[PDB]
Each structure stands twice: as structure tokens, then as C-alpha cells.
Nucleic acid binder design. Structure first.
Lengths: 102, 261
RNA sequence: AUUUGUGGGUGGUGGUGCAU
């Protein structure tokens, strides 16, 4: 009975969500039908009419003219690099053994 | 005073946007961008009540269709208001997925982001959490190199603060193109952070934060060559005077051994 | 006039005890 009531409550809430979605869609359709034209006509009949910017423009011009970049990553440990090389060598040796096997 | 029909249509469009996060936008919204009074239409519709997905869709439409200055101003205003509202609403100062999508669209818009939105957020003084979130979003979606260099230079020219420092840290993580003037701006910001022993300064004698220390470490790792011998020595002096212990040594070493432009 | 051929980075809008 509890699971049946759970299914019933979930279905009721889903139906409520679907009804809300349908109402929202109907409202949006009514808006697109009438308020769209009303707002278009009203906007046609109506009207609606720097230091940082200069610094940014100067910086952009300088970046276009000249550049000096070195995206160098952080240096890793020599022991870590040697271990990685050893692992790569082990993988290569295993691949060679597998190739020899078939 | 807007007409009665204009007010009714704008209110209907605003309510449709508020109650709609999925589906199709109204023809009112589809035709509002086709007019010149976009700001007036937005003000009449009260777009501050819209939903996050609707706001993201509107921002994308403004970026794709509207012009440079009009969409730039509209994006600046709407994005600043929405960011403040979302930061206030979220207890942990978190954003929504649609908000992040709209932010990515605004960042792709070069004029509306640095001049319109990033300038607005920095000028309004976004908090530390907001600055960190902005740095994460920028590292996720870096903008064009010219805009990135311009924003980095603007942040360097602006005084040292939480938002400018976090923007500088994000730019250092991105590792964009640094011109001669960009490297000069970075060195000027470093000098402004560093102390001077006739007229002293608050930002000169102040202590830098961990975000600033990490930004300085990344800058020393990356843009050593953009700094000449004099700028490298200046960075070494900054690491000695107003530097750190765990990050200050690497900063001094990179400033001493870095290439010159 | 933003995009391509070629390289290339790539997990935490993480959970997380505990002390403060």
C-alpha cells in the first residue's frame, strides 16, 4: 500500500508538473501571438536614445605589435622522471615479449 | 512613460521568461532584439525576475544578434545584477549551470566581457569567492589572446585588490601572450606591490596574499623572458623584500636566472 | 574576414573525519 501511494503521489506530482508546463506553453503562445506584435509596434513608435577602454585598446595594439611569451611548465623531479622512464621501458619490454609470444 | 500596450507586452514577456526555463522563447523575445530600444524593452519587462536558463538563452541571443555597444551595456547590467543576486541567494556563493553558460557566452563576446562585464565586476569589487569562481571560469574558457592581454594590463594598471589579484592569477594560469607593454604592466604591478624605501605606500608596505604569491610564482615560471635584465632584477628584489618563504625562493631564483626580452 | 592543418594541456563550482 505504501508503494502504491508512492506511485500515486509521484504520478500526481508529475501530472501537476505537466499541467504547469502546458499552462506555461499556452501563456508563451499567447505572448508570441499578441504581446510580440504589441511590443514590436510600441518599439517602432518609440525610441531609447573610458580610461579603462583606452588602456585596453593600447594594450591590445601593443600585444599585436610585439610579444614575448614563454609558457614553461614547472620542472619535475629527476627521480620522478627516471621512474617514469623506467616504467616506459618496462612497458616496451613487455610489448616486445608479447610480440615474441605472438 | 511607456504605453499601456507596451507595458503589458513587456510584463507578459518577463513573466514568460521567469516561468520558462525549457521550451521555446516567445515571439516577443524573438522580436525585441530586432528593435533599437533593447534597453527600454528590458527595463519595461523587468528582466531581473527571469529564470536562469531563460537568462542564459537571452544572453546567448544578445551575443549572437545584438550589436557591440548595445549588447555590451545590456550584458554588463544584466550579468552584474544576476551575479550579485545569485551570490546573495546561494549560501555558499555558488552559481548555476545556465549562469555559467551565460558567463561563457559573455566571455566569448570580447567587448562585452572585458570592457562591459569584467570591468563591471572588478569595479563593483567582486568578493574573494566571486573572484575565485571567475578565475576558475576563465581558466575553463579562456577568451581571445588580445582580450586576455588587455584585461591583464587593465588589472595590472588598476590598484592591487582581491579582484584584480585573482584576475592576474587566472591570467598567469592561462599563460596568454605578453607583449612588451604587457610585461611592463606586470612589472609595474609587481613594483606597486613591492615596498619603496622617499614616499612610502600602503600597497607597497602591505603583505600580499597566498593567491598573490601563487600568481607571482606562476609569473616567474612563465614570463621570465618577457622581463628584461632590469625587470628580472626588480622581480628578484620584490621576492626578497615583499616575497615569501615557500614561494619566495623560487620567485627570486626565476627572477635571477630568467631570460631577457 | 571569427575559423583551419599541425602539437598540446585534461579531472575535482568533489565527499571528507578531526583540531581550531
Amino acid at each position: 500500500k505504501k508503494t502504491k501511494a508512492e506511485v500515486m503521489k509521484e504520478v500526481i506530482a508529475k501530472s501537476k508538473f505537466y499541467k504547469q508546463e502546458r499552462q506555461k506553453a499556452q501563456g508563451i503562445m499567447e505572448d508570441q501571438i499578441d504581446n510580440l506584435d504589441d511590443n514590436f509596434e510600441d518599439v517602432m513608435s518609440e525610441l531609447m536614445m573610458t580610461d579603462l577602454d583606452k588602456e585596453y585598446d593600447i594594450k591590445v595594439k601593443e600585444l599585436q605589435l610585439d610579444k614575448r611569451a614563454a609558457p614553461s611548465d614547472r620542472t619535475k623531479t629527476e627521480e620522478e622522471k627516471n621512474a617514469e622512464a623506467e616504467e616506459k621501458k618496462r612497458e616496451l619490454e613487455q610489448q616486445r615479449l608479447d610480440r615474441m609470444n605472438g | 512613460a511607456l504605453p499601456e500596450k507596451v507595458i503589458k507586452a513587456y510584463t507578459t514577456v518577463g513573466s514568460i521568461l521567469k516561468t520558462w526555463t525549457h521550451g521555446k522563447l516567445p515571439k516577443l523575445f524573438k522580436v525585441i532584439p530586432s528593435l533599437r530600444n533593447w534597453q527600454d524593452v528590458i527595463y519595461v519587462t523587468n528582466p531581473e525576475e527571469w529564470s536562469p536558463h531563460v537568462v542564459y538563452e537571452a544572453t546567448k541571443l544578445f551575443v549572437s544578434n545584438l550589436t557591440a555597444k548595445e549588447s555590451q551595456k545590456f550584458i554588463n547590467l544584466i550579468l552584474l545584477e544576476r551575479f550579485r543576486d545569485n551570490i546573495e541567494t546561494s549560501e555558499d556563493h555558488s552559481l548555476n549551470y545556465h549562469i555559467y553558460r551565460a558567463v561563457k557566452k559573455s566571455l566569448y563576446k570580447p567587448s562585452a566581457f572585458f570592457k562591459g562585464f569584467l570591468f563591471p565586476l572588478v569595479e563593483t569589487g567582486c568578493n574573494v569567492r566571486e573572484a575565485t569562481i571567475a578565475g576558475s571560469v576563465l581558466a575553463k574558457v579562456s577568451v581571445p589572446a588580445l582580450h586576455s592581454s588587455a584585461a591583464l594590463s587593465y588589472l595590472l594598471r588598476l590598484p592591487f585588490s582581491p579582484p584584480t589579484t585573482v584576475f592576474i592569477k587566472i591570467l598567469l594560469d592561462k599563460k596568454y601572450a605578453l607583449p612588451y607593454q604587457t610585461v611592463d604592466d606586470c612589472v609595474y604591478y609587481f613594483m606597486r606591490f613591492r615596498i619603496l624605501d622617499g614616499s612610502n605606500g600602503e600597497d607597497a608596505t602591505r603583505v600580499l596574499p597566498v593567491i598573490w604569491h601563487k600568481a607571482f610564482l606562476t609569473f616567474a615560471q612563465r614570463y621570465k623572458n618577457d622581463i628584461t635584465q632590469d625587470q628580472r632584477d626588480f622581480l628578484l628584489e620584490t621576492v626578497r623584500q615583499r616575497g615569501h618563504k615557500d614561494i619566495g625562493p623560487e620567485i627570486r631564483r626565476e627572477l635571477l636566472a630568467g631570460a631577457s626580452r
